[PDB]
Amino acid sequence: MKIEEGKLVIWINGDKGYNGLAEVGKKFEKDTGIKVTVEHPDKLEEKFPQVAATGDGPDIIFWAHDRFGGYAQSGLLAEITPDKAFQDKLYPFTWDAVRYNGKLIAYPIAVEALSLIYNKDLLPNPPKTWEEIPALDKELKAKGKSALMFNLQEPYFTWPLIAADGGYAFKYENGKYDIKDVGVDNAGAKAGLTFLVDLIKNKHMNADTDYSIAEAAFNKGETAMTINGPWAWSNIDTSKVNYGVTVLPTFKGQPSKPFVGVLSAGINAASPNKELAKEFLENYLLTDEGLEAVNKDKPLGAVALKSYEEELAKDPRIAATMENAQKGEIMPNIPQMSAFWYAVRTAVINAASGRQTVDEALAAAQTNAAAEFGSSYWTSEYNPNAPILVGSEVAYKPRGEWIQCEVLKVVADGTRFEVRDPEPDELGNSGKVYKCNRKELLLIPPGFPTKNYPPGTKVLARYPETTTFYPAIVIGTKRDGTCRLRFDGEKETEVTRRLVLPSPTALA
Amino acid sequence: ARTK
Protein backbone atom coordinates (compact mmCIF):
# COMPACT_ATOMS: atom_id res chain seq x y z
CA MET A 1 0.00 0.00 0.00
CA LYS A 2 0.98 3.67 -0.38
CA ILE A 3 2.72 5.24 2.62
CA GLU A 4 -0.16 7.70 2.76
CA GLU A 5 -2.79 5.00 3.37
CA GLY A 6 -4.61 4.60 6.67
CA LYS A 7 -4.50 8.10 8.15
CA LEU A 8 -5.36 11.67 7.17
CA VAL A 9 -2.86 14.45 6.50
CA ILE A 10 -4.38 17.90 6.06
CA TRP A 11 -2.67 21.10 4.86
CA ILE A 12 -3.96 24.55 5.78
CA ASN A 13 -2.31 27.97 5.72
CA GLY A 14 -0.49 29.25 8.83
CA ASP A 15 -2.80 32.27 9.08
CA LYS A 16 -5.85 30.02 9.58
CA GLY A 17 -7.16 28.16 12.64
CA TYR A 18 -5.02 25.02 12.35
CA ASN A 19 -5.24 24.38 16.11
CA GLY A 20 -9.04 24.55 15.95
CA LEU A 21 -8.97 22.24 12.93
CA ALA A 22 -6.91 19.77 14.97
CA GLU A 23 -9.67 19.82 17.62
CA VAL A 24 -12.05 18.69 14.87
CA GLY A 25 -9.37 16.11 14.02
CA LYS A 26 -9.45 14.79 17.58
CA LYS A 27 -13.23 14.28 17.45
CA PHE A 28 -12.79 12.31 14.22
CA GLU A 29 -9.93 10.31 15.77
CA LYS A 30 -12.04 9.38 18.80
CA ASP A 31 -14.90 8.06 16.64
CA THR A 32 -12.90 6.37 13.90
CA GLY A 33 -9.62 5.25 15.49
CA ILE A 34 -7.84 6.90 12.55
CA LYS A 35 -5.10 9.50 13.03
CA VAL A 36 -5.44 13.03 11.61
CA THR A 37 -2.38 15.26 11.24
CA VAL A 38 -2.85 18.96 10.44
CA GLU A 39 0.15 20.73 8.92
CA HIS A 40 0.75 24.32 7.85
CA PRO A 41 3.89 24.31 5.68
CA ASP A 42 5.16 27.54 4.18
CA LYS A 43 4.23 28.18 0.54
CA LEU A 44 1.81 25.26 0.66
CA GLU A 45 -0.03 26.51 -2.46
CA GLU A 46 3.24 26.08 -4.39
CA LYS A 47 4.32 22.87 -2.63
CA PHE A 48 1.02 21.03 -3.14
CA PRO A 49 1.21 20.56 -6.93
CA GLN A 50 4.80 19.28 -6.75
CA VAL A 51 3.98 16.54 -4.25
CA ALA A 52 0.48 15.75 -5.53
CA ALA A 53 1.82 15.29 -9.06
CA THR A 54 3.85 12.29 -7.82
CA GLY A 55 0.81 10.72 -6.12
CA ASP A 56 1.96 11.98 -2.71
CA GLY A 57 1.02 14.97 -0.57
CA PRO A 58 -1.75 15.63 1.92
CA ASP A 59 -5.14 13.93 1.60
CA ILE A 60 -6.91 17.28 2.06
CA ILE A 61 -5.68 20.71 1.01
CA PHE A 62 -7.19 23.98 2.23
CA TRP A 63 -6.81 27.22 0.26
CA ALA A 64 -8.98 29.93 -1.23
CA HIS A 65 -10.84 28.63 -4.26
CA ASP A 66 -8.77 30.64 -6.79
CA ARG A 67 -6.00 28.04 -6.96
CA PHE A 68 -8.26 25.02 -7.22
CA GLY A 69 -9.14 25.27 -10.92
CA GLY A 70 -5.44 24.89 -11.71
CA TYR A 71 -5.12 21.91 -9.40
CA ALA A 72 -8.24 20.33 -10.90
CA GLN A 73 -7.11 20.96 -14.49
CA SER A 74 -3.80 19.30 -13.61
CA GLY A 75 -5.62 16.18 -12.38
CA LEU A 76 -4.66 16.74 -8.74
CA LEU A 77 -8.15 16.90 -7.21
CA ALA A 78 -10.80 14.23 -6.84
CA GLU A 79 -14.37 15.04 -7.81
CA ILE A 80 -16.26 15.22 -4.52
CA THR A 81 -19.47 13.26 -3.98
CA PRO A 82 -21.81 15.16 -1.60
CA ASP A 83 -25.41 14.05 -1.87
CA LYS A 84 -28.32 16.45 -2.34
CA ALA A 85 -29.09 16.52 1.39
CA PHE A 86 -25.50 17.59 2.07
CA GLN A 87 -25.48 20.11 -0.76
CA ASP A 88 -28.57 21.73 0.75
CA LYS A 89 -26.55 22.58 3.89
CA LEU A 90 -24.27 25.12 2.13
CA TYR A 91 -25.06 28.31 0.23
CA PRO A 92 -25.29 27.78 -3.54
CA PHE A 93 -22.89 30.72 -4.12
CA THR A 94 -20.22 28.80 -2.22
CA TRP A 95 -20.69 25.60 -4.24
CA ASP A 96 -20.33 27.70 -7.40
CA ALA A 97 -16.86 28.84 -6.28
CA VAL A 98 -15.66 25.22 -6.14
CA ARG A 99 -16.93 24.14 -9.57
CA TYR A 100 -14.53 23.48 -12.40
CA ASN A 101 -15.63 22.25 -15.83
CA GLY A 102 -19.06 21.63 -14.27
CA LYS A 103 -17.70 19.30 -11.55
CA LEU A 104 -17.44 19.97 -7.81
CA ILE A 105 -13.73 19.82 -6.98
CA ALA A 106 -13.69 20.91 -3.33
CA TYR A 107 -15.87 21.60 -0.31
CA PRO A 108 -16.45 25.30 0.34
CA ILE A 109 -15.85 26.42 3.93
CA ALA A 110 -16.17 30.22 4.24
CA VAL A 111 -16.35 33.50 2.38
CA GLU A 112 -13.40 35.89 2.89
CA ALA A 113 -12.98 39.55 1.99
CA LEU A 114 -10.63 42.23 3.24
CA SER A 115 -11.93 45.08 5.38
CA LEU A 116 -10.53 48.23 6.89
CA ILE A 117 -9.58 47.57 10.51
CA TYR A 118 -9.08 50.62 12.68
CA ASN A 119 -8.08 51.56 16.23
CA LYS A 120 -11.17 53.23 17.79
CA ASP A 121 -9.11 54.97 20.49
CA LEU A 122 -6.65 56.51 18.03
CA LEU A 123 -9.27 56.99 15.35
CA PRO A 124 -12.94 56.99 16.40
CA ASN A 125 -14.02 58.21 12.95
CA PRO A 126 -11.96 56.48 10.25
CA PRO A 127 -11.51 57.99 6.79
CA LYS A 128 -14.05 57.23 4.10
CA THR A 129 -11.52 57.84 1.30
CA TRP A 130 -8.01 56.79 0.35
CA GLU A 131 -7.42 60.46 -0.45
CA GLU A 132 -7.83 61.31 3.24
CA ILE A 133 -4.99 59.06 4.34
CA PRO A 134 -2.06 61.46 3.69
CA ALA A 135 -3.51 64.22 5.91
CA LEU A 136 -4.41 61.70 8.60
CA ASP A 137 -0.85 60.37 8.57
CA LYS A 138 0.53 63.92 8.93
CA GLU A 139 -1.75 64.41 11.98
CA LEU A 140 -0.80 61.08 13.58
CA LYS A 141 2.96 61.40 12.95
CA ALA A 142 2.93 64.37 15.35
CA LYS A 143 2.16 61.90 18.12
CA GLY A 144 4.57 59.25 16.88
CA LYS A 145 1.87 57.19 15.17
CA SER A 146 1.06 56.38 11.54
CA ALA A 147 -2.26 56.17 9.68
CA LEU A 148 -2.02 52.84 7.87
CA MET A 149 0.09 49.71 7.59
CA PHE A 150 -0.75 46.61 5.58
CA ASN A 151 1.04 43.77 3.75
CA LEU A 152 2.74 45.17 0.63
CA GLN A 153 4.41 41.85 -0.33
CA GLU A 154 1.20 40.07 -1.32
CA PRO A 155 -0.83 41.67 -4.12
CA TYR A 156 -4.07 40.43 -2.54
CA PHE A 157 -3.92 43.38 -0.11
CA THR A 158 -3.31 46.05 -2.76
CA TRP A 159 -5.84 44.62 -5.22
CA PRO A 160 -8.86 46.44 -3.69
CA LEU A 161 -7.22 49.79 -4.53
CA ILE A 162 -5.99 48.66 -8.00
CA ALA A 163 -9.50 47.50 -8.87
CA ALA A 164 -11.36 50.53 -7.42
CA ASP A 165 -11.06 52.83 -10.47
CA GLY A 166 -11.15 50.05 -13.07
CA GLY A 167 -8.39 47.46 -12.73
CA TYR A 168 -9.43 43.85 -13.30
CA ALA A 169 -7.78 40.44 -13.60
CA PHE A 170 -9.53 38.64 -16.46
CA LYS A 171 -12.57 39.96 -18.29
CA TYR A 172 -15.68 37.81 -17.91
CA GLU A 173 -17.46 37.53 -21.28
CA ASN A 174 -20.01 34.95 -22.51
CA GLY A 175 -19.91 32.84 -19.33
CA LYS A 176 -16.09 32.59 -19.20
CA TYR A 177 -12.88 34.43 -18.38
CA ASP A 178 -10.93 35.66 -21.38
CA ILE A 179 -7.25 34.97 -20.67
CA LYS A 180 -6.32 37.35 -23.52
CA ASP A 181 -8.18 40.24 -21.85
CA VAL A 182 -6.12 41.22 -18.78
CA GLY A 183 -6.98 44.50 -16.97
CA VAL A 184 -3.90 45.17 -14.84
CA ASP A 185 -2.53 47.92 -17.10
CA ASN A 186 -5.56 50.11 -17.79
CA ALA A 187 -6.09 53.66 -16.54
CA GLY A 188 -7.86 52.46 -13.39
CA ALA A 189 -5.15 50.04 -12.37
CA LYS A 190 -2.47 52.67 -13.07
CA ALA A 191 -4.32 55.28 -10.98
CA GLY A 192 -4.64 52.93 -7.98
CA LEU A 193 -1.04 51.71 -8.03
CA THR A 194 0.12 55.31 -8.50
CA PHE A 195 -1.74 56.29 -5.35
CA LEU A 196 -0.02 53.48 -3.43
CA VAL A 197 3.43 54.46 -4.77
CA ASP A 198 2.78 58.09 -3.84
CA LEU A 199 1.86 57.04 -0.27
CA ILE A 200 5.28 55.40 -0.07
CA LYS A 201 7.20 58.27 -1.76
CA ASN A 202 5.61 60.64 0.75
CA LYS A 203 6.62 58.41 3.69
CA HIS A 204 3.10 57.39 4.71
CA MET A 205 4.02 53.74 4.11
CA ASN A 206 7.19 51.66 3.78
CA ALA A 207 7.65 49.44 0.70
CA ASP A 208 9.14 46.72 2.94
CA THR A 209 6.04 46.28 5.12
CA ASP A 210 4.85 42.67 5.14
CA TYR A 211 2.14 40.69 6.92
CA SER A 212 4.03 40.33 10.21
CA ILE A 213 5.21 43.95 10.40
CA ALA A 214 1.76 45.41 9.71
CA GLU A 215 0.09 43.04 12.17
CA ALA A 216 2.58 43.81 14.94
CA ALA A 217 2.28 47.58 14.39
CA PHE A 218 -1.51 47.54 14.48
CA ASN A 219 -1.76 45.16 17.42
CA LYS A 220 0.75 47.23 19.42
CA GLY A 221 -1.18 50.48 18.74
CA GLU A 222 1.52 52.06 16.57
CA THR A 223 -0.61 52.46 13.44
CA ALA A 224 -4.27 53.54 13.41
CA MET A 225 -5.41 51.26 10.58
CA THR A 226 -4.66 48.04 8.79
CA ILE A 227 -6.20 46.04 5.95
CA ASN A 228 -6.85 42.40 6.74
CA GLY A 229 -9.32 39.53 6.74
CA PRO A 230 -11.36 37.69 9.37
CA TRP A 231 -8.49 35.32 10.25
CA ALA A 232 -6.62 38.31 11.77
CA TRP A 233 -9.27 39.27 14.34
CA SER A 234 -8.18 36.74 17.00
CA ASN A 235 -4.75 38.29 17.40
CA ILE A 236 -6.33 41.73 17.69
CA ASP A 237 -8.73 40.46 20.39
CA THR A 238 -5.71 39.23 22.37
CA SER A 239 -4.01 42.63 21.98
CA LYS A 240 -4.97 45.71 24.00
CA VAL A 241 -6.38 47.44 20.92
CA ASN A 242 -10.03 48.54 20.75
CA TYR A 243 -10.83 47.90 17.09
CA GLY A 244 -13.57 48.27 14.51
CA VAL A 245 -14.02 46.56 11.15
CA THR A 246 -15.52 48.69 8.42
CA VAL A 247 -15.91 49.45 4.71
CA LEU A 248 -12.67 49.98 2.79
CA PRO A 249 -11.89 53.56 1.80
CA THR A 250 -13.13 54.71 -1.62
CA PHE A 251 -10.73 55.81 -4.37
CA LYS A 252 -11.74 58.50 -6.86
CA GLY A 253 -15.20 58.24 -5.29
CA GLN A 254 -15.53 54.55 -6.13
CA PRO A 255 -15.60 51.63 -3.70
CA SER A 256 -12.45 49.61 -3.15
CA LYS A 257 -13.10 46.23 -4.75
CA PRO A 258 -11.51 43.39 -2.80
CA PHE A 259 -11.24 39.97 -4.33
CA VAL A 260 -13.65 37.54 -2.69
CA GLY A 261 -12.12 34.20 -1.72
CA VAL A 262 -13.92 31.07 -0.60
CA LEU A 263 -11.74 29.01 1.74
CA SER A 264 -12.12 25.50 0.33
CA ALA A 265 -11.00 21.92 1.09
CA GLY A 266 -9.95 19.69 -1.79
CA ILE A 267 -9.27 15.96 -1.75
CA ASN A 268 -6.03 14.79 -3.42
CA ALA A 269 -6.84 12.75 -6.55
CA ALA A 270 -4.13 10.25 -5.57
CA SER A 271 -5.27 9.86 -1.95
CA PRO A 272 -5.99 6.26 -0.93
CA ASN A 273 -8.10 7.81 1.84
CA LYS A 274 -10.87 9.52 -0.12
CA GLU A 275 -13.70 8.03 1.95
CA LEU A 276 -12.01 8.97 5.23
CA ALA A 277 -11.55 12.50 3.84
CA LYS A 278 -15.22 12.75 2.83
CA GLU A 279 -16.30 11.56 6.30
CA PHE A 280 -14.04 14.11 7.97
CA LEU A 281 -15.18 17.03 5.84
CA GLU A 282 -18.90 16.27 5.69
CA ASN A 283 -19.53 14.71 9.09
CA TYR A 284 -17.03 16.53 11.32
CA LEU A 285 -15.81 19.79 9.84
CA LEU A 286 -18.90 21.08 8.00
CA THR A 287 -21.15 21.00 11.06
CA ASP A 288 -22.01 23.71 13.58
CA GLU A 289 -19.59 22.20 16.09
CA GLY A 290 -16.79 21.66 13.57
CA LEU A 291 -16.84 25.17 12.17
CA GLU A 292 -17.23 26.70 15.64
CA ALA A 293 -14.00 24.96 16.75
CA VAL A 294 -12.04 26.40 13.83
CA ASN A 295 -13.71 29.81 14.04
CA LYS A 296 -12.93 30.10 17.78
CA ASP A 297 -9.25 29.71 16.97
CA LYS A 298 -9.14 32.14 13.99
CA PRO A 299 -12.37 33.54 12.51
CA LEU A 300 -13.35 31.92 9.20
CA GLY A 301 -15.41 34.83 7.85
CA ALA A 302 -18.93 34.23 6.54
CA VAL A 303 -19.22 30.44 6.67
CA ALA A 304 -20.68 28.31 3.88
CA LEU A 305 -22.82 26.31 6.33
CA LYS A 306 -26.23 28.00 6.52
CA SER A 307 -27.07 26.80 10.03
CA TYR A 308 -23.93 28.18 11.66
CA GLU A 309 -23.92 31.35 9.55
CA GLU A 310 -27.29 32.40 10.96
CA GLU A 311 -25.33 33.10 14.15
CA LEU A 312 -22.25 34.77 12.63
CA ALA A 313 -24.44 36.99 10.43
CA LYS A 314 -25.16 39.28 13.40
CA ASP A 315 -21.49 40.02 14.08
CA PRO A 316 -20.79 43.60 12.92
CA ARG A 317 -17.35 42.44 11.71
CA ILE A 318 -19.10 39.89 9.47
CA ALA A 319 -21.55 42.53 8.23
CA ALA A 320 -18.53 44.66 7.29
CA THR A 321 -16.84 41.68 5.63
CA MET A 322 -19.88 41.08 3.44
CA GLU A 323 -20.32 44.74 2.58
CA ASN A 324 -16.74 44.75 1.29
CA ALA A 325 -17.31 41.40 -0.46
CA GLN A 326 -20.40 42.79 -2.25
CA LYS A 327 -18.38 45.75 -3.49
CA GLY A 328 -15.68 43.41 -4.77
CA GLU A 329 -15.64 40.43 -7.11
CA ILE A 330 -15.27 36.69 -6.71
CA MET A 331 -11.82 35.50 -7.75
CA PRO A 332 -11.68 33.41 -10.92
CA ASN A 333 -10.49 29.84 -10.41
CA ILE A 334 -9.00 29.37 -13.87
CA PRO A 335 -5.56 27.74 -14.24
CA GLN A 336 -4.09 31.12 -15.29
CA MET A 337 -4.56 32.50 -11.76
CA SER A 338 -1.09 31.42 -10.59
CA ALA A 339 0.54 33.35 -13.48
CA PHE A 340 -1.70 36.32 -12.71
CA TRP A 341 -0.67 36.40 -9.05
CA TYR A 342 3.06 36.12 -9.78
CA ALA A 343 2.75 38.98 -12.28
CA VAL A 344 0.80 41.35 -10.02
CA ARG A 345 2.98 40.52 -7.02
CA THR A 346 6.09 41.50 -9.00
CA ALA A 347 4.48 44.69 -10.34
CA VAL A 348 3.40 45.89 -6.89
CA ILE A 349 6.78 45.13 -5.28
CA ASN A 350 8.78 46.72 -8.12
CA ALA A 351 6.64 49.86 -8.28
CA ALA A 352 6.54 50.24 -4.47
CA SER A 353 10.33 49.96 -4.20
CA GLY A 354 10.91 52.41 -7.06
CA ARG A 355 12.82 49.85 -9.10
CA GLN A 356 10.28 50.33 -11.90
CA THR A 357 7.70 53.01 -12.65
CA VAL A 358 4.01 52.16 -12.38
CA ASP A 359 3.72 52.13 -16.20
CA GLU A 360 6.77 49.84 -16.59
CA ALA A 361 5.67 47.47 -13.82
CA LEU A 362 2.06 47.13 -15.02
CA ALA A 363 3.04 46.72 -18.70
CA ALA A 364 5.20 43.73 -17.72
CA ALA A 365 2.38 42.36 -15.55
CA GLN A 366 -0.09 42.63 -18.45
CA THR A 367 2.25 40.55 -20.61
CA ASN A 368 3.07 37.93 -18.01
CA ALA A 369 -0.31 37.49 -16.32
CA ALA A 370 -1.40 35.81 -19.56
CA ALA A 371 1.77 33.71 -20.06
CA GLU A 372 2.77 30.07 -19.59
CA PHE A 373 5.52 29.55 -17.01
CA GLY A 374 7.70 26.77 -15.71
CA SER A 375 9.79 26.00 -12.66
CA SER A 376 13.21 24.52 -12.11
CA TYR A 377 13.32 20.97 -10.78
CA TRP A 378 15.81 22.34 -8.25
CA THR A 379 14.21 23.77 -5.14
CA SER A 380 16.01 25.87 -2.54
CA GLU A 381 14.94 27.60 0.66
CA TYR A 382 17.02 30.64 -0.34
CA ASN A 383 16.22 31.23 -4.02
CA PRO A 384 12.92 30.98 -5.95
CA ASN A 385 12.58 28.41 -8.75
CA ALA A 386 9.52 29.96 -10.41
CA PRO A 387 8.18 31.57 -12.51
CA ILE A 388 10.41 30.82 -15.48
CA LEU A 389 8.86 32.97 -18.21
CA VAL A 390 9.67 34.02 -21.74
CA GLY A 391 12.32 36.69 -21.08
CA SER A 392 13.59 35.12 -17.86
CA GLU A 393 17.32 34.78 -17.39
CA VAL A 394 18.48 31.28 -16.37
CA ALA A 395 21.62 29.23 -15.86
CA TYR A 396 21.57 26.29 -18.25
CA LYS A 397 23.66 23.09 -18.04
CA PRO A 398 25.19 22.15 -21.42
CA ARG A 399 24.94 18.44 -22.31
CA GLY A 400 30.55 21.75 -13.77
CA GLU A 401 29.88 25.01 -15.61
CA TRP A 402 26.41 26.38 -16.31
CA ILE A 403 25.86 29.18 -18.84
CA GLN A 404 23.65 32.25 -18.69
CA CYS A 405 20.74 32.08 -21.14
CA GLU A 406 17.54 33.95 -21.94
CA VAL A 407 14.30 31.99 -22.14
CA LEU A 408 12.71 32.16 -25.61
CA LYS A 409 9.94 29.57 -25.21
CA VAL A 410 8.14 27.71 -22.44
CA VAL A 411 6.17 24.72 -23.71
CA ALA A 412 4.44 21.51 -22.58
CA ASP A 413 3.12 22.98 -19.31
CA GLY A 414 6.56 24.24 -18.32
CA THR A 415 8.41 20.96 -18.83
CA ARG A 416 10.39 22.03 -21.91
CA PHE A 417 12.17 25.28 -22.64
CA GLU A 418 13.98 26.91 -25.50
CA VAL A 419 16.85 29.00 -24.13
CA ARG A 420 19.47 31.11 -25.86
CA ASP A 421 23.04 31.93 -24.93
CA PRO A 422 23.16 35.45 -26.40
CA GLU A 423 26.94 35.46 -26.91
CA PRO A 424 28.14 35.01 -30.48
CA ASP A 425 28.62 31.35 -31.48
CA GLU A 426 30.26 29.68 -34.49
CA LEU A 427 26.75 28.63 -35.58
CA GLY A 428 25.20 32.07 -35.13
CA ASN A 429 26.28 35.50 -34.02
CA SER A 430 22.92 36.03 -32.30
CA GLY A 431 23.72 33.10 -30.01
CA LYS A 432 23.09 29.39 -29.65
CA VAL A 433 19.61 28.06 -28.93
CA TYR A 434 19.15 24.98 -26.76
CA LYS A 435 16.15 22.85 -25.87
CA CYS A 436 16.05 21.70 -22.24
CA ASN A 437 14.05 20.18 -19.40
CA ARG A 438 13.42 21.32 -15.79
CA LYS A 439 16.55 19.64 -14.41
CA GLU A 440 18.79 21.54 -16.84
CA LEU A 441 18.07 25.10 -15.77
CA LEU A 442 18.01 27.34 -12.72
CA LEU A 443 16.07 30.58 -12.48
CA ILE A 444 18.13 33.75 -12.05
CA PRO A 445 15.61 35.73 -9.99
CA PRO A 446 14.93 39.07 -11.74
CA GLY A 447 14.13 41.04 -8.60
CA PHE A 448 15.84 42.08 -5.41
CA PRO A 449 16.92 39.01 -3.39
CA THR A 450 15.09 38.16 -0.15
CA LYS A 451 17.37 35.68 1.70
CA ASN A 452 21.08 35.06 2.45
CA TYR A 453 22.78 31.71 1.76
CA PRO A 454 24.28 30.44 5.06
CA PRO A 455 28.10 30.40 5.24
CA GLY A 456 29.42 27.11 3.82
CA THR A 457 26.63 26.68 1.23
CA LYS A 458 27.75 25.24 -2.10
CA VAL A 459 26.49 27.52 -4.87
CA LEU A 460 26.74 28.23 -8.57
CA ALA A 461 27.87 31.79 -9.14
CA ARG A 462 28.62 33.93 -12.15
CA TYR A 463 32.37 34.59 -12.35
CA PRO A 464 33.35 38.24 -12.82
CA GLU A 465 33.71 39.26 -16.50
CA THR A 466 31.99 36.06 -17.64
CA THR A 467 28.48 34.84 -18.35
CA THR A 468 29.30 31.42 -16.92
CA PHE A 469 28.24 30.06 -13.51
CA TYR A 470 30.93 28.09 -11.69
CA PRO A 471 30.82 26.06 -8.48
CA ALA A 472 31.74 28.04 -5.36
CA ILE A 473 31.37 28.11 -1.61
CA VAL A 474 29.74 30.96 0.35
CA ILE A 475 32.19 32.39 2.88
CA GLY A 476 29.70 35.01 4.05
CA THR A 477 27.30 37.81 3.11
CA LYS A 478 27.85 41.56 3.53
CA ARG A 479 25.22 43.86 5.09
CA ASP A 480 24.44 45.26 1.63
CA GLY A 481 23.70 41.65 0.60
CA THR A 482 26.89 41.03 -1.46
CA CYS A 483 28.23 37.45 -1.40
CA ARG A 484 31.82 36.68 -0.46
CA LEU A 485 32.75 33.48 -2.29
CA ARG A 486 35.54 31.03 -2.81
CA PHE A 487 35.34 29.65 -6.35
CA ASP A 488 36.31 25.99 -6.74
CA GLY A 489 39.44 25.21 -8.76
CA GLU A 490 40.74 28.74 -9.21
CA LYS A 491 41.73 36.62 -2.73
CA GLU A 492 38.06 35.81 -2.04
CA THR A 493 35.62 36.91 -4.75
CA GLU A 494 32.71 39.28 -4.21
CA VAL A 495 29.65 38.49 -6.32
CA THR A 496 26.28 40.26 -6.26
CA ARG A 497 23.62 38.15 -4.54
CA ARG A 498 21.45 38.14 -7.72
CA LEU A 499 24.18 36.12 -9.47
CA VAL A 500 24.50 33.41 -6.80
CA LEU A 501 22.31 30.32 -7.35
CA PRO A 502 21.75 26.90 -5.73
CA SER A 503 24.08 24.05 -6.65
CA PRO A 504 22.19 21.09 -8.18
CA THR A 505 25.28 18.89 -7.58
CA ALA A 506 25.06 19.66 -3.86
CA LEU A 507 21.25 19.37 -3.83
CA ALA A 508 21.40 15.98 -5.59
CA ALA B 1 29.08 32.24 -23.23
CA ARG B 2 31.85 34.46 -21.89
CA THR B 3 34.29 32.33 -19.85
CA LYS B 4 37.10 32.66 -17.18
Ligand SMILES: OC[C@H]1O[C@H](O[C@H]2[C@H](O)[C@@H](O)[C@@H](O)O[C@@H]2CO)[C@H](O)[C@@H](O)[C@@H]1O
Ligand atom coordinates in the same frame (compact mmCIF):
# COMPACT_ATOMS: atom_id res chain seq x y z
O1 LIG C 1 -1.49 37.76 -2.76
C1 LIG C 1 -1.85 36.78 -3.72
C2 LIG C 1 -2.64 35.65 -3.05
O2 LIG C 1 -3.93 36.14 -2.69
C3 LIG C 1 -4.85 35.23 -2.12
O3 LIG C 1 -4.35 34.71 -0.90
C4 LIG C 1 -4.84 35.29 0.29
C5 LIG C 1 -5.85 34.31 0.90
O4 LIG C 1 -6.98 34.16 0.06
C6 LIG C 1 -6.27 34.77 2.28
O5 LIG C 1 -7.03 33.79 2.94
C7 LIG C 1 -5.04 35.04 3.16
O6 LIG C 1 -4.35 33.84 3.42
O7 LIG C 1 -4.18 35.96 2.52
C8 LIG C 1 -3.68 35.52 1.26
C9 LIG C 1 -2.74 36.60 0.75
O8 LIG C 1 -1.46 36.54 1.36
C10 LIG C 1 -5.07 34.07 -3.10
O9 LIG C 1 -5.98 33.16 -2.53
C11 LIG C 1 -3.72 33.41 -3.39
O10 LIG C 1 -3.93 32.34 -4.30
C12 LIG C 1 -2.75 34.43 -3.98
O11 LIG C 1 -1.48 33.84 -4.16
